[model samples]
Target chain A: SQQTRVLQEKLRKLKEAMLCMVCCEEEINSTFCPCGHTVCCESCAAQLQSCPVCRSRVEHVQHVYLPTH
Target chain B: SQQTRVLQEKLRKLKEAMLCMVCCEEEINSTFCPCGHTVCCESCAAQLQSCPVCRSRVEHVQHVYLPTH
Candidate 1:
């Protein structure tokens, strides 16, 4: 139970700093391109062909599934 | 078409900055509790009873659906 509580605390702090890069309104879900940039959500990621920051060709989008607390 | 292009560019920029706070690995999907903190995803938010940042009792979690580009 102590470990679980500590993990939850860590997750909470992590969430406080996370925000979507596009709208800056919601949480992010996918990383763009091969640059491993983790700033865009699924909706926004679908619109781009390249990494917004590096202009690298977007090879694929990675979906992030975080561990549950 | 030009306006649409501009909007797309803006969205791209926005997406570049967003990231999840909980896992620090995915995009955030919901704001936890009543503190209006947007850090946790749907899975993680369900487990939280209070705002991760302020430690305020979480009243409700809000799902954020961003517009498609």
Candidate 2:
């Protein structure tokens, strides 16, 4: 059960890595901030001017796509 | 429990960021390679000459610490 639990935790990591930090409803699309942290979707990112993770000024929010099955 | 689960998932990120990539046992303690990813401890890194994450040639293994937790 411990190994199964370990894999479960790791699977959650894969899921979380694909989700937007702001809404958790979509995959992260925009890559911005001076610190270069990608944590938001374009919709949520449009409402933000600073990175929620590091609080750095977000000068640009360029869209990025990582196709996954 | 919506926000609660989201918060917990984000908090686990703090935990993962501190773990070594090779053994996943200790905190990441050194920096190296052409990619500049901090992903392994000195012990696990002792036998390594390339970053496990990116396979970049590790020219140096410089230890780094962030105190005051």
Candidate 3:
């Protein structure tokens, strides 16, 4: 039980730390191409045509699973 | 050992499911104001002024840890 509780707490902390870059409210779930920059969510990724950081032509955008926590 | 393996598998799946909206590569780590939209990461949130979806004036942007996964 203690281990489960600890795991839950850790999961909560991890969720709290993961924020969306564009909206800053939701979790991130997407990536942009040309520069291969990962900084936005699925909702925001669908609106732009190029990478926000490098301004490179976005050839493709897809979801990425980053295991940082 | 089996329980730990199950937990690890769940964590892996959770990480795989979370994606960024802007870049579509990194995990989300921020949100925008006025409309309370969550769809970006920390790196890209600094460049935005409004919600990408609603176009609401971004009063503030901050990182939020969403517990969806």
Candidate 4:
């Protein structure tokens, strides 16, 4: 079970690192532009008017479904 | 052994989908443009003048070391 356990843990850990750069609390779910950085959840994306990573103007926000859309 | 094999196969499959959107051979090694869609290899990203995913004008290119960088 060692190999399986390691595999499961690694997979679980993989998704956990893509955290929202704003809140640092949630998984990122949106991409913002004109600096199209996908660094925050939809909640944070809507709340801000600038890209969190570069502070560039947020001209648009779009959902990037993790594995859905 | 079965579980481990399945886990390895799934992980392998996961990375296979993230291969260079252009070459479909190399793994993605860069993120490009103001429209930061991480979708291709450094070699391919360097040659393109527009973001491959959205056709956004490529203003900048940057490497994002994976493991969820």
Candidate 5:
């Protein structure tokens, strides 16, 4: 039980820093482009051709998937 | 025979060009917001806070769609 509690605590801490600001959705994977923007998943990357925030043309984009939660 | 053959080719080309822009009608030219949780069309890029896919938050993106040929 203690071990489980410790693991849960770790997970909770990780969640605090990596939570998606929009929709309050937990990110399974994340990515960042040259424009200094980050995302939670690949589906989001494929949705558009430019950044949704500043509307800058992204020359490079990256996708990273986190381990299953 | 030449006339019918040319007509068939033209018809085929026309059919290919008329297909949907993206994979689906709902599929807009949306890019990933930095948050990466939702997909926004080209028009909505200015108002997005993060990627609709993974919801990581983005600042730039590439936008382009090739018409069917």
Candidate 6:
């Protein structure tokens, strides 16, 4: 049952990552900002210095989730 | 009508090549698995020894169809 459960969870996580607005084609390595306006990857955030969609200055950013499947 | 025809043709070609029925992702082209099912990208075909869904061993792959528009 553990293997099945793990596989199911992996599938669900993969689906979620695919649906994520940013980094969907690659992977889910980003999170939505507090303003709920934009999602950005780590590299994008480092380079842009602000939310691309909202232009809001970001104070802190961290990886909030793990990638699966 | 000319402009509309061109736009329509472009859209149709973009949709066909980008939409892989197996993966539901925008793949560059389809690769073949030994079992007769064909669905994968060049990168995936090389990295994977078999089909992700069926686990069938992959052998030859070709991009016979060109993206039109």
- Candidate that scores best on TM-score: 4
The digit string of per-residue lDDT tens for model 6 on A1-69 reads 455555555445534533334545544244323432224445654555665666667554433222121
Give each prediction's DockQ, rounded to 2 decimals.
0.02, 0.04, 0.04, 0.22, 0.01, 0.01
For candidate 4, write residues B1-69 as lDDT tens digits: 899999998777766666787888987656665565777878898999987678888786665433364
Tens digits of lDDT, candidate 4, A1-69: 898999988777765656776687887757775565777778888988876567788787755533211
B1-69, model 3: which lDDT tens digit per residue? 466556666666666556656787776656564355556777877887776767878776655434343
**How good is chain A of candidate 4, measured by TM-score?**
0.68
- B1-69, model 2: which lDDT tens digit per residue? 455556566557766766777787887655553355656767987778786766878776555332201
Per-residue lDDT value at A7 in model 2: 52
Q: What TM-score do all the candidates reach, one by one?
A: 0.37, 0.45, 0.37, 0.58, 0.30, 0.29
Write model 5 residue lDDT over A1-69, tens digit each, in one string: 455555555445545445543444665243435554554445555555676655767665554322222
Model 2 clashes, total count:
0
Q: Report clash pairs, candidate 2.
A: none
**Stretches of model 5 off by over 4 angstroms after superposition:** A1-14, A65-69, B1-69
1 against 6, candidate with superior DockQ: 1
Q: Quote model 3's TM-score.
A: 0.37
If both were scored by lDDT, which would come out higher, candidate 4 or candidate 6?
Answer: 4
Q: Model 3: which docking level applies?
A: incorrect
Best by DockQ: 4
* Each candidate: chain B TM-score: 0.62, 0.74, 0.63, 0.74, 0.39, 0.45
Report residue A13 deviation for candidate 5 (angstroms): 6.9
True contacts kept of each: 0.00, 0.00, 0.00, 0.24, 0.00, 0.00
Q: On lDDT, who's better, 3 or 4?
A: 4
Model 5: per-residue Cα lDDT over B7-69, one tens digit each: 555544443333323332333333453333223345565555665446566776544231111
What TM-score quantifies how close candidate 4 is to the native fold? Answer: 0.58
Which window of ten consecutive residues has the lowest lDDT sum in model 4 chain B?
Answer: B60-69
